[PDB]
Amino acid sequence: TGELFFRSGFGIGMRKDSPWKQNVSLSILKSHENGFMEDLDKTWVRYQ
Amino acid sequence: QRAVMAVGSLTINEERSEVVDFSVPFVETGISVMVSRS
Amino acid sequence: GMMGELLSGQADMIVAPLTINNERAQYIEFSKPFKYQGLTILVKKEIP
Ligand SMILES: Cc1sc2nc(COc3ccc(F)cc3)cc(=O)n2c1[C@@H]1C[C@H]1CO
Ligand SMILES: *[C@@H]1O[C@H](CO)[C@@H](O)[C@H](O)[C@H]1NC(C)=O
Numbered sequence: 001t002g003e004l005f006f007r008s009g010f011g012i013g014m015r016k017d018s019p020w021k022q023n024v025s026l027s028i029l030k031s032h033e034n035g036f037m038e039d040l041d042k043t044w045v046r047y048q
Numbered sequence: 049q050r051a052v053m054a055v056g057s058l059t060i061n062e063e064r065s066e067v068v069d070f071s072v073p074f075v076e077t078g079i080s081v082m083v084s085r086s
Numbered sequence: 087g088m089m090g091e092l093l094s095g096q097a098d099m100i101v102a103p104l105t106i107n108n109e110r111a112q113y114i115e116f117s118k119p120f121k122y123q124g125l126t127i128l129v130k131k132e133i134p
Contacts (some may be wrong), residue, residue, distance in 0.1 A: 001122070001126070001127050001128075001129050002101035002126055002127040003124075003125055003126070003129065004123070004125065004126060005125045005126075006124060006125050007123065007125075008105050008106050008120060008123075009105075009119025009120065009121060009122045009123065010103050010104060010105060010106070010119050010120045010121065010123075011091070011104060011105075011106050011116030011117050011119050011120075012084065012099070012100060012101060012116065012117035012118075013088065013092060013099070013100025013102075013104055013110075013114050013115075014099065014100070014115045014116070014117065015092065015098065015115065016115055017111065018098065018099075018115075020099075021115070021117070022065075024117050025117055025118055025132070026062060026065070027119070028117060028118045028120075029061070029062045029065065030062065032063075032118075033062070033106070036115075037120070037121075039106025045051065047106060060118075072106075072116075073119075076122040
């Protein structure tokens with residue numbers, strides 16, 4: 001019930017000295033724009 | 049190197065992220081179509 | 087919790103449904119969000 005409040009998305013926790021920033025951001029963008037996220041949603045949302 | 053900060057409607061894309069950085073998005077959008085009823 | 091474990095060296099990469107807050111961002115870097123969601127109120131079903 002009700003409406004969404006304090007709408008904030010999730011994220012991947014990292015560290016300031018970790019050199020895996022771009023290599024993870026590009027993977028996330030690939031998953032988003034290549035339908036991987038859509039497939040995961042379809043396989044994990046709207047069960048009934 | 050002709051400016052510092054760019055403000056506008058620039059969707060985050062891989063083909064643009066390798067030459068310029070981006071901050072945390074504040075507005076969510078996407079791709080959609082609009083069809084009339086009658 | 088998870089942020090303390092990461093800061094203590096027991097972990098390096100955080101992959102979990104963790105929200106984004108200013109205090110968390112001041113110490114732990116967050117990648118691109120997965121989905122945009124908010125907070126809602128849960129109420130048990132009431133019989134008619
Ligand atoms: C305000 C808005 S509008 C907004 N939209 C989204 C939608 O999903 C994405 C996914 C990838 C991306 F590159 C950009 C957006 C997420 C999100 O967290 N937000 C936010 C909170 C503040 C930002 C934290 O990341
Ligand atoms: C991914 O591999 C390493 C580790 O992060 C990084 O130095 C490299 O630049 C990345 N690859 C590309 C193509 O950016």
